[PDB]
Write a protein that binds this DNA or RNA. Sequence first.
RNA 1: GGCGAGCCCGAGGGGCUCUCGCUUCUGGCGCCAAGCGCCCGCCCGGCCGGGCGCGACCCGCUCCGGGGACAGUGCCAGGU
RNA 2: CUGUUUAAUUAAAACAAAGCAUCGCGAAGGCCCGCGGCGGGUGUUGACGCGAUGUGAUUUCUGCCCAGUGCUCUGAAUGU
RNA 3: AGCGCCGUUCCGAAGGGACGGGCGAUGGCCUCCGUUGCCCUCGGCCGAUCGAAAGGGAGUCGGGUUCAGAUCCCCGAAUC
Lengths: 252, 68, 234, 117
Amino acid sequence: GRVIRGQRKGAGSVFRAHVKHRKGAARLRAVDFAERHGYIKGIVKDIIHDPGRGAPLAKVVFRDPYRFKKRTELFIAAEGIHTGQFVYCGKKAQLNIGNVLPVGTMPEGTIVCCLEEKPGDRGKLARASGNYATVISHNPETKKTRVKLPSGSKKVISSANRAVVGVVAGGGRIDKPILKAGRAYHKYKAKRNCWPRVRGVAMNPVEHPFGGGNHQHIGKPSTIRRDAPAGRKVGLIAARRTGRLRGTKTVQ
Amino acid sequence: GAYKYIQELWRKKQSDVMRFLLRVRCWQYRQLSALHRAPRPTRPDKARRLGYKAKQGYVIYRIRVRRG
Amino acid sequence: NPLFEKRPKNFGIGQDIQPKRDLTRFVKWPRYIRLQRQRAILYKRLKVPPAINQFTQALDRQTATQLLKLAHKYRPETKQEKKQRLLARAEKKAAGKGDVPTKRPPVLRAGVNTVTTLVENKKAQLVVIAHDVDPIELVVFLPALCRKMGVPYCIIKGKARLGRLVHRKTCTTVAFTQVNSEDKGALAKLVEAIRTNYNDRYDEIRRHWGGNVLGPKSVARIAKLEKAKAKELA
Amino acid sequence: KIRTSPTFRRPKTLRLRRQPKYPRKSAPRRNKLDHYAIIKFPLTTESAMKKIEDNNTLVFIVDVKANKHQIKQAVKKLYDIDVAKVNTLIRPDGEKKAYVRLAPDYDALDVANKIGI
RNA sequence: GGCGAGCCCGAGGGGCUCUCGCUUCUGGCGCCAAGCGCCCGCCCGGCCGGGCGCGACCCGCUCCGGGGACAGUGCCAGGU
RNA sequence: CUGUUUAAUUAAAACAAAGCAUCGCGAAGGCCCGCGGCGGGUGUUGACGCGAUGUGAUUUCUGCCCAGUGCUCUGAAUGU
RNA sequence: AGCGCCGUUCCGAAGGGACGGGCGAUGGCCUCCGUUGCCCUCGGCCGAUCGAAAGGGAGUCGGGUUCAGAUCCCCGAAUC
Ligand SMILES: [Mg+2]
Ligand SMILES: [Mg+2]
Ligand SMILES: [Mg+2]
Ligand SMILES: [Mg+2]
Ligand SMILES: [Mg+2]
Ligand SMILES: [Mg+2]
Ligand SMILES: [Mg+2]
Ligand SMILES: [Mg+2]
Ligand SMILES: [Mg+2]
Ligand SMILES: [Mg+2]
Ligand SMILES: [Mg+2]
Ligand SMILES: [Mg+2]
Ligand SMILES: [Mg+2]
Ligand SMILES: [Mg+2]
Ligand SMILES: [Mg+2]
């Protein structure tokens, strides 16, 4: 039959990111000599708003120790930082809110954000607004470090990758309800075309595996396995359980 | 005088003296481009029995295709 | 003395900028540069067969200089003096009506086919085998063949230097077959030294494997772990 | 030789100047668009005639491959008269219409009577 | 390398065993070298304009890290 | 609730909507496109995110059943 | 298999430019200047190129003129 809505995301025709008004990708400095054997001062000029992101962007200018030129980068603004605050980066940088330093230097229990999976990919984990990771379980031999992620998962990562100390500013963004369709339209128009949200039972049988019949009923079990083909995975995908929760996660 | 020795060394191409050179040449040719020019043949006996004569005009290309 | 002050600069982290250093091991080299460098490093890392580890085990430079001083006056003629000898011998035989003015011309033989034929027919007194042949399969049969036919062979480093004694880019093989009376003793001494070096130790080189050398960072890592193991034992 | 930069690029080689052994067409192609081929037809209509008295300006029909400089040079090399400015339009039949204003020292009526219009 | 610490022997000193360091109140500035030691054509033991090294340690065989005989790729076979 | 919908027979009690929830995914990943490449969309993105779903503001509520069909987890402990 | 397809910085030796100095040659009034060749030194392009007659984009306005032109043609007055 007809190609479902779930398969049309991969075409990239009208489902791309509305990426023109975004100011730039929020990464750290690439790793160099000064960020592994010392520290270097940088000056935050301002903080701005990246559209599609509720977290504020921070425009921190640096000084290049090799050729005389002031390099401008784009950090994720931590909570409580202000313009003119000297952001310090490197290995032996003193631990304050806004200073990025490798996780082997910081002690356990340090609440950080914008950390890295692999050492040297300029910040991947914990980048949404108001989220943080918990650093525990350092190891002298076999240089690893456990981090508690915002989903509750404990991931063992390397001990050389960097992380800015603090939480991401803009926390509590999901406290207010959207309260009408208009703010949802403007929010998703700012982010990307992800809002033709039509009910799969309400749509046609030839366009979705659930819809049709004289009554709006699903008819088939919505728990559909991970080994399903493309276009079959509708509803619950590989659901180990369903219904109301009991406990917190109960998953090791 | 030599090309029969080159052929007989090339025939049993599973032996330890040949498979090292074969692995080194496969790495060297895989890390090159897909279609390019080799300035001289690497199998002189096989090239000469296919028709290579060492004079101005005969050009050896090295080319890489994908199996399957 | 009037003003002439000193203005020192401190080149640490977080202060005045770094000077232009050598930057040799950190420049992004092109494709073929990286290919030849990691090709040499790949031959150094991986285990080579015992028929190609004979290369880099070659003759020392004093005996190679003696060999070049012997081979300098058995040089094959180039095109200019070849045509000169042809025209001069033709004019002398046309002037004198002579039959056989030349008794025996001494000249070495080059080329792998010619040298292989001469060692199979036992006409070669000495074999010079070049090192820098990039298909090694063209060369690998020659040492065992010279050993089983009893002709002494010497591995030498540099095929360009062996081509410049034959007036060509590559020569790859030099066969000493004919020697004069003033050179027979020197060639006998050279053949004695080469049979001492190569043919008497042919059963030694054929058994030994070459290569199997790790990189110096990993060697220093293993040495640091060995010093830590000695600290644990003591 | 110390390579301070971490990027290796092309050396400035010696690009050879082109010096061919033989010419490719044995002769220069002659100028088809010369002074007798640029300015083709003088226009003798009512408004183009009125421009001679009221404008001190001649009206010509020109091939479309010419410009103001070539029209000005063609007039100065054929009629030996000075040119103030040339206003060119494209007449919709396919030709160019050129209004050539002359110097105040010259007389457009006298030039028109000498050329025959 | 001591303007530094260390654990001991210990008279000066020894380095069994180890850490690198020369930027943390400030919305400033920082590049195209100062100095030193040599080498040249010039003014009788003077003056102009240049080149090298130290400043900026030496060597090495991967640009540096993270995986790594796994993942993937090609073919065959069984499920769905 | 405002909005949208069968242009050329329907304007709705239909669709959408904020809210309520559920499931998959920590990037060698989840959902997909592609005949092909470690090619692409999400991704200038990192669980307050992305993707797929049921219900449809607020108040009060979310009864009982895993027998069946699904989904998921586990032990080469054991049949095929 | 293939007309070709993917991709726009990814796996690229992807700048032919220029200040200053030195050496050589030529030309012009060899007074004094201008070119050409070589050497030293400098030089992120976010990568050729296209893409708006409503986006960005320096600078013209007044009067008169024909049956049909108008900030365009004539006069006068300005600017890049
Ligand atoms: Mg809530
Ligand atoms: Mg919804
Ligand atoms: Mg809906
Ligand atoms: Mg169906
Ligand atoms: Mg050739
Ligand atoms: Mg590696
Ligand atoms: Mg490992
Ligand atoms: Mg109706
Ligand atoms: Mg409700
Ligand atoms: Mg993914
Ligand atoms: Mg119920
Ligand atoms: Mg059960
Ligand atoms: Mg354009
Ligand atoms: Mg009009
Ligand atoms: Mg007007």
